[PDB]
Amino acid sequence: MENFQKVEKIGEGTYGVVYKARNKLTGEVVALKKIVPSTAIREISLLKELNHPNIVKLLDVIHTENKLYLVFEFLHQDLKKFMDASALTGIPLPLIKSYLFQLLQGLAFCHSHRVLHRDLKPQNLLINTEGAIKLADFGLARAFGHEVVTLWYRAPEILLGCKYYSTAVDIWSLGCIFAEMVTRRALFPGDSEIDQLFRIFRTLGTPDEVVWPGVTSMPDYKPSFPKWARQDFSKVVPPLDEDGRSLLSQMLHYDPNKRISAKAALAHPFFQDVTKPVPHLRL
Numbered sequence: 011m012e013n014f015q016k017v018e019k020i021g022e023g024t025y026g027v028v029y030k031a032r033n034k035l036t037g038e039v040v041a042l043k044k045i046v047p048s049t050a051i052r053e054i055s056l057l058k059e060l061n062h063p064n065i066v067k068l069l070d071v072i073h074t075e076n077k078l079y080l081v082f083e084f085l086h087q088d089l090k091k092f093m094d095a096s097a098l099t100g101i102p103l104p105l106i107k108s109y110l111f112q113l114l115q116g117l118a119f120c121h122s123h124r125v126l127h128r129d130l131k132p133q134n135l136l137i138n139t140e141g142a143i144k145l146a147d148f149g150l151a152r153a154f155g156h157e158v159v160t161l162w163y164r165a166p167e168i169l170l171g172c173k174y175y176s177t178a179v180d181i182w183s184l185g186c187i188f189a190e191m192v193t194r195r196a197l198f199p200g201d202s203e204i205d206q207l208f209r210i211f212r213t214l215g216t217p218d219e220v221v222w223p224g225v226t227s228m229p230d231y232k233p234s235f236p237k238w239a240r241q242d243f244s245k246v247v248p249p250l251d252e253d254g255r256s257l258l259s260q261m262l263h264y265d266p267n268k269r270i271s272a273k274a275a276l277a278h279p280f281f282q283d284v285t286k287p288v289p290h291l292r293l
Protein backbone atom coordinates (compact mmCIF):
# COMPACT_ATOMS: atom_id res chain seq x y z
CA MET A 11 0.00 0.00 0.00
CA GLU A 12 2.98 2.34 0.38
CA ASN A 13 2.71 2.60 -3.41
CA PHE A 14 -0.74 4.20 -3.28
CA GLN A 15 -2.18 7.52 -2.15
CA LYS A 16 -5.91 7.55 -1.40
CA VAL A 17 -7.75 10.33 -3.22
CA GLU A 18 -11.32 9.67 -2.08
CA LYS A 19 -13.80 7.03 -0.95
CA ILE A 20 -15.94 6.29 -4.00
CA GLY A 21 -18.02 3.58 -2.40
CA GLU A 22 -18.69 1.09 0.36
CA GLY A 23 -18.92 -2.19 -1.57
CA THR A 24 -20.52 -5.21 0.07
CA TYR A 25 -17.15 -6.66 1.10
CA GLY A 26 -14.67 -3.88 1.68
CA VAL A 27 -14.35 -0.20 0.82
CA VAL A 28 -13.40 1.23 -2.58
CA TYR A 29 -11.10 4.23 -3.06
CA LYS A 30 -9.86 6.29 -5.98
CA ALA A 31 -6.07 6.25 -5.67
CA ARG A 32 -2.80 7.05 -7.44
CA ASN A 33 0.28 4.84 -7.81
CA LYS A 34 3.07 6.80 -6.09
CA LEU A 35 5.53 5.38 -8.62
CA THR A 36 3.78 5.17 -12.00
CA GLY A 37 1.38 8.01 -11.19
CA GLU A 38 -1.37 5.77 -12.53
CA VAL A 39 -4.89 6.49 -11.24
CA VAL A 40 -6.82 3.43 -10.12
CA ALA A 41 -9.68 2.14 -7.99
CA LEU A 42 -8.39 0.43 -4.85
CA LYS A 43 -10.63 -2.01 -3.01
CA LYS A 44 -9.73 -3.12 0.51
CA ILE A 45 -11.45 -6.41 1.36
CA VAL A 46 -7.81 -14.71 4.42
CA PRO A 47 -8.70 -18.21 3.12
CA SER A 48 -6.22 -19.61 0.61
CA THR A 49 -9.20 -20.58 -1.55
CA ALA A 50 -10.12 -16.90 -1.80
CA ILE A 51 -6.64 -15.98 -3.02
CA ARG A 52 -6.76 -18.66 -5.73
CA GLU A 53 -10.26 -17.70 -6.88
CA ILE A 54 -9.31 -14.03 -7.08
CA SER A 55 -6.22 -15.01 -9.08
CA LEU A 56 -8.34 -16.66 -11.76
CA LEU A 57 -10.37 -13.47 -12.05
CA LYS A 58 -7.14 -11.77 -13.12
CA GLU A 59 -7.13 -13.71 -16.40
CA LEU A 60 -10.82 -12.97 -17.03
CA ASN A 61 -10.27 -10.01 -19.35
CA HIS A 62 -12.90 -8.42 -21.60
CA PRO A 63 -13.69 -4.84 -22.77
CA ASN A 64 -16.90 -4.87 -20.73
CA ILE A 65 -15.39 -6.13 -17.48
CA VAL A 66 -13.47 -3.73 -15.23
CA LYS A 67 -9.85 -4.86 -15.56
CA LEU A 68 -8.37 -6.25 -12.36
CA LEU A 69 -4.79 -4.94 -12.49
CA ASP A 70 -3.28 -6.53 -9.39
CA VAL A 71 -4.00 -8.32 -6.13
CA ILE A 72 -2.06 -7.29 -3.04
CA HIS A 73 -2.03 -9.63 -0.05
CA THR A 74 -0.13 -8.13 2.87
CA GLU A 75 -0.56 -8.54 6.61
CA ASN A 76 -3.45 -10.97 6.30
CA LYS A 77 -5.02 -8.11 4.34
CA LEU A 78 -6.34 -8.20 0.77
CA TYR A 79 -6.34 -5.31 -1.71
CA LEU A 80 -7.67 -5.38 -5.25
CA VAL A 81 -6.34 -2.87 -7.78
CA PHE A 82 -8.73 -2.09 -10.62
CA GLU A 83 -8.62 0.16 -13.66
CA PHE A 84 -10.45 3.39 -12.80
CA LEU A 85 -13.68 4.28 -14.57
CA HIS A 86 -15.20 7.75 -14.70
CA GLN A 87 -18.62 7.20 -13.07
CA ASP A 88 -21.08 4.53 -11.95
CA LEU A 89 -24.47 3.89 -13.56
CA LYS A 90 -26.42 4.84 -10.44
CA LYS A 91 -25.01 8.37 -10.46
CA PHE A 92 -25.62 8.63 -14.21
CA MET A 93 -29.23 7.47 -13.78
CA ASP A 94 -29.85 9.99 -11.00
CA ALA A 95 -28.31 12.69 -13.19
CA SER A 96 -30.59 11.66 -16.06
CA ALA A 97 -33.77 11.34 -13.96
CA LEU A 98 -35.35 14.55 -15.27
CA THR A 99 -35.05 13.65 -18.95
CA GLY A 100 -34.22 9.95 -18.88
CA ILE A 101 -31.33 8.17 -20.58
CA PRO A 102 -31.81 8.17 -24.38
CA LEU A 103 -33.15 4.81 -25.60
CA PRO A 104 -30.21 4.42 -28.00
CA LEU A 105 -27.81 4.70 -25.06
CA ILE A 106 -29.89 2.35 -22.92
CA LYS A 107 -29.77 -0.20 -25.75
CA SER A 108 -26.02 0.25 -26.21
CA TYR A 109 -25.44 -0.23 -22.48
CA LEU A 110 -27.66 -3.33 -22.33
CA PHE A 111 -25.94 -4.77 -25.40
CA GLN A 112 -22.45 -4.24 -23.93
CA LEU A 113 -23.41 -5.70 -20.55
CA LEU A 114 -24.88 -8.76 -22.27
CA GLN A 115 -21.57 -9.10 -24.10
CA GLY A 116 -19.72 -8.93 -20.80
CA LEU A 117 -22.02 -11.50 -19.20
CA ALA A 118 -21.78 -13.82 -22.21
CA PHE A 119 -18.00 -13.79 -21.79
CA CYS A 120 -18.04 -14.41 -18.03
CA HIS A 121 -20.75 -17.05 -18.36
CA SER A 122 -18.86 -18.86 -21.13
CA HIS A 123 -16.10 -19.26 -18.54
CA ARG A 124 -18.52 -20.50 -15.88
CA VAL A 125 -18.09 -17.32 -13.85
CA LEU A 126 -21.11 -15.39 -12.65
CA HIS A 127 -21.51 -12.07 -10.87
CA ARG A 128 -24.30 -12.81 -8.39
CA ASP A 129 -24.80 -9.20 -7.34
CA LEU A 130 -25.35 -6.94 -10.34
CA LYS A 131 -26.67 -3.47 -9.53
CA PRO A 132 -26.42 0.12 -10.86
CA GLN A 133 -23.67 0.78 -8.31
CA ASN A 134 -21.27 -1.75 -9.82
CA LEU A 135 -21.91 -0.93 -13.47
CA LEU A 136 -19.29 1.62 -14.52
CA ILE A 137 -19.20 3.98 -17.48
CA ASN A 138 -16.73 6.21 -19.28
CA THR A 139 -16.77 9.18 -21.64
CA GLU A 140 -16.30 6.92 -24.69
CA GLY A 141 -19.71 5.28 -24.34
CA ALA A 142 -18.50 2.04 -22.79
CA ILE A 143 -20.04 0.43 -19.72
CA LYS A 144 -18.36 -2.27 -17.66
CA LEU A 145 -19.19 -4.87 -15.01
CA ALA A 146 -17.29 -4.51 -11.72
CA ASP A 147 -16.89 -6.82 -8.68
CA PHE A 148 -17.36 -9.74 -11.03
CA GLY A 149 -16.79 -13.16 -9.48
CA LEU A 150 -16.01 -11.72 -6.05
CA ALA A 151 -19.17 -13.06 -4.40
CA ARG A 152 -17.99 -16.62 -5.08
CA ALA A 153 -14.60 -15.69 -3.64
CA PHE A 154 -15.60 -14.14 -0.31
CA GLY A 155 -19.35 -14.49 0.16
CA HIS A 156 -23.32 -1.32 8.03
CA GLU A 157 -25.05 -0.17 4.85
CA VAL A 158 -27.98 -2.41 3.93
CA VAL A 159 -27.39 -4.74 0.98
CA THR A 160 -29.93 -4.05 -1.76
CA LEU A 161 -32.22 -6.94 -2.70
CA TRP A 162 -33.85 -5.10 -5.61
CA TYR A 163 -31.99 -7.06 -8.29
CA ARG A 164 -32.04 -10.53 -6.72
CA ALA A 165 -33.44 -13.39 -8.84
CA PRO A 166 -36.46 -15.25 -7.40
CA GLU A 167 -34.62 -18.59 -7.21
CA ILE A 168 -32.09 -17.05 -4.81
CA LEU A 169 -34.92 -15.62 -2.73
CA LEU A 170 -36.67 -18.99 -2.69
CA GLY A 171 -33.61 -20.72 -1.25
CA CYS A 172 -31.94 -22.32 -4.26
CA LYS A 173 -28.42 -23.21 -3.10
CA TYR A 174 -26.88 -23.77 -6.54
CA TYR A 175 -28.13 -20.96 -8.75
CA SER A 176 -26.91 -20.45 -12.31
CA THR A 177 -25.80 -17.80 -14.75
CA ALA A 178 -29.52 -17.02 -15.07
CA VAL A 179 -29.36 -14.96 -11.88
CA ASP A 180 -27.26 -12.34 -13.70
CA ILE A 181 -29.72 -12.10 -16.58
CA TRP A 182 -32.51 -11.45 -14.07
CA SER A 183 -30.54 -8.66 -12.39
CA LEU A 184 -29.67 -7.09 -15.74
CA GLY A 185 -33.33 -7.25 -16.76
CA CYS A 186 -34.31 -5.35 -13.61
CA ILE A 187 -31.66 -2.72 -14.36
CA PHE A 188 -32.80 -2.47 -17.99
CA ALA A 189 -36.37 -1.74 -16.81
CA GLU A 190 -35.11 0.86 -14.33
CA MET A 191 -33.11 2.74 -16.96
CA VAL A 192 -36.23 2.88 -19.13
CA THR A 193 -38.83 3.88 -16.52
CA ARG A 194 -36.53 5.82 -14.18
CA ARG A 195 -37.82 3.91 -11.17
CA ALA A 196 -36.64 0.67 -9.58
CA LEU A 197 -38.67 -2.30 -10.81
CA PHE A 198 -38.77 -4.32 -7.54
CA PRO A 199 -37.63 -2.07 -4.66
CA GLY A 200 -38.04 -4.55 -1.81
CA ASP A 201 -36.86 -3.63 1.68
CA SER A 202 -36.78 -7.20 3.02
CA GLU A 203 -36.60 -10.64 1.44
CA ILE A 204 -40.31 -11.36 1.68
CA ASP A 205 -41.20 -7.87 0.49
CA GLN A 206 -38.80 -8.34 -2.44
CA LEU A 207 -40.36 -11.69 -3.25
CA PHE A 208 -43.95 -10.43 -2.98
CA ARG A 209 -43.17 -7.32 -5.07
CA ILE A 210 -41.99 -9.68 -7.82
CA PHE A 211 -45.10 -11.84 -7.36
CA ARG A 212 -47.42 -8.83 -7.53
CA THR A 213 -45.98 -7.83 -10.90
CA LEU A 214 -45.14 -11.10 -12.65
CA GLY A 215 -47.81 -13.14 -10.89
CA THR A 216 -47.28 -15.67 -8.13
CA PRO A 217 -45.30 -18.54 -9.65
CA ASP A 218 -46.78 -22.03 -9.78
CA GLU A 219 -45.88 -25.40 -11.29
CA VAL A 220 -47.29 -24.34 -14.66
CA VAL A 221 -44.82 -21.52 -15.36
CA TRP A 222 -42.05 -22.85 -13.10
CA PRO A 223 -41.91 -26.65 -12.74
CA GLY A 224 -40.46 -27.58 -9.35
CA VAL A 225 -41.01 -24.17 -7.75
CA THR A 226 -43.41 -25.46 -5.09
CA SER A 227 -40.62 -27.73 -3.85
CA MET A 228 -38.10 -24.91 -3.38
CA PRO A 229 -36.58 -24.55 0.13
CA ASP A 230 -38.38 -21.33 1.03
CA TYR A 231 -41.54 -21.77 -1.01
CA LYS A 232 -44.74 -21.62 1.05
CA PRO A 233 -48.11 -23.00 -0.11
CA SER A 234 -49.48 -20.07 1.87
CA PHE A 235 -47.92 -17.47 -0.45
CA PRO A 236 -50.62 -15.09 -1.68
CA LYS A 237 -51.68 -15.73 -5.28
CA TRP A 238 -51.41 -12.57 -7.37
CA ALA A 239 -52.25 -12.37 -11.07
CA ARG A 240 -49.63 -11.38 -13.65
CA GLN A 241 -49.57 -7.81 -15.02
CA ASP A 242 -49.11 -6.81 -18.67
CA PHE A 243 -45.62 -5.61 -19.55
CA SER A 244 -47.18 -2.66 -21.37
CA LYS A 245 -48.04 -1.51 -17.85
CA VAL A 246 -44.72 -2.47 -16.26
CA VAL A 247 -42.49 -0.68 -18.78
CA PRO A 248 -44.71 1.59 -20.94
CA PRO A 249 -41.88 3.55 -22.64
CA LEU A 250 -40.25 0.37 -23.96
CA ASP A 251 -41.23 -0.65 -27.49
CA GLU A 252 -42.53 -4.18 -28.13
CA ASP A 253 -39.09 -5.54 -29.12
CA GLY A 254 -37.67 -4.28 -25.84
CA ARG A 255 -40.61 -5.63 -23.86
CA SER A 256 -40.27 -9.01 -25.53
CA LEU A 257 -36.59 -9.17 -24.58
CA LEU A 258 -37.28 -7.97 -21.04
CA SER A 259 -39.95 -10.63 -20.55
CA GLN A 260 -37.49 -13.36 -21.52
CA MET A 261 -34.90 -11.94 -19.13
CA LEU A 262 -37.49 -12.05 -16.35
CA HIS A 263 -38.82 -15.58 -16.87
CA TYR A 264 -39.39 -17.26 -13.49
CA ASP A 265 -37.90 -20.63 -14.48
CA PRO A 266 -34.10 -20.09 -14.61
CA ASN A 267 -33.91 -22.71 -17.38
CA LYS A 268 -36.36 -20.79 -19.55
CA ARG A 269 -34.74 -17.42 -18.87
CA ILE A 270 -32.87 -16.21 -21.94
CA SER A 271 -29.08 -16.55 -21.97
CA ALA A 272 -26.75 -13.60 -22.58
CA LYS A 273 -25.68 -15.08 -25.92
CA ALA A 274 -29.24 -15.60 -27.14
CA ALA A 275 -30.23 -12.15 -25.92
CA LEU A 276 -27.50 -10.65 -28.12
CA ALA A 277 -29.27 -12.08 -31.18
CA HIS A 278 -32.65 -10.62 -30.15
CA PRO A 279 -34.36 -8.29 -32.69
CA PHE A 280 -34.15 -5.42 -30.19
CA PHE A 281 -30.46 -5.06 -31.03
CA GLN A 282 -30.88 -5.00 -34.79
CA ASP A 283 -30.30 -1.25 -34.79
CA VAL A 284 -27.94 -0.97 -31.83
CA THR A 285 -25.37 1.84 -31.97
CA LYS A 286 -22.81 3.28 -29.56
CA PRO A 287 -23.83 6.82 -28.53
CA VAL A 288 -21.64 8.84 -26.20
CA PRO A 289 -23.17 9.86 -22.86
CA HIS A 290 -23.17 13.41 -21.55
CA LEU A 291 -21.07 13.00 -18.41
CA ARG A 292 -20.51 15.65 -15.77
CA LEU A 293 -17.29 14.64 -14.02
Ligand SMILES: CN(C)C[C@@H](O)COc1ccc(Nc2ncc(Br)c(Nc3ccccc3)n2)cc1
Nearest residue numbers: 020021023028041082084085086087088091146
Ligand atom coordinates in the same frame (compact mmCIF):
# COMPACT_ATOMS: atom_id res chain seq x y z
C1 LIG B 1 -23.35 10.32 -6.28
N1 LIG B 1 -21.94 10.38 -5.82
C2 LIG B 1 -21.79 10.54 -4.34
C3 LIG B 1 -20.99 9.41 -6.48
C4 LIG B 1 -21.13 7.90 -6.07
O1 LIG B 1 -22.19 7.29 -6.79
C5 LIG B 1 -19.80 7.13 -6.39
O2 LIG B 1 -19.26 7.63 -7.66
C6 LIG B 1 -18.30 6.81 -8.31
C7 LIG B 1 -17.27 7.44 -9.09
C8 LIG B 1 -16.29 6.65 -9.76
C9 LIG B 1 -16.33 5.24 -9.65
N2 LIG B 1 -15.33 4.41 -10.32
C10 LIG B 1 -14.89 3.04 -10.17
N3 LIG B 1 -13.90 2.63 -10.99
C11 LIG B 1 -13.48 1.34 -10.86
C12 LIG B 1 -14.07 0.46 -9.89
BR1 LIG B 1 -13.48 -1.35 -9.71
C13 LIG B 1 -15.11 1.00 -9.09
N4 LIG B 1 -15.76 0.15 -8.11
C14 LIG B 1 -16.83 0.32 -7.14
C15 LIG B 1 -17.67 -0.80 -6.87
C16 LIG B 1 -18.74 -0.71 -5.94
C17 LIG B 1 -18.98 0.52 -5.27
C18 LIG B 1 -18.17 1.65 -5.52
C19 LIG B 1 -17.09 1.55 -6.45
N5 LIG B 1 -15.49 2.27 -9.26
C20 LIG B 1 -17.37 4.61 -8.87
C21 LIG B 1 -18.34 5.39 -8.21
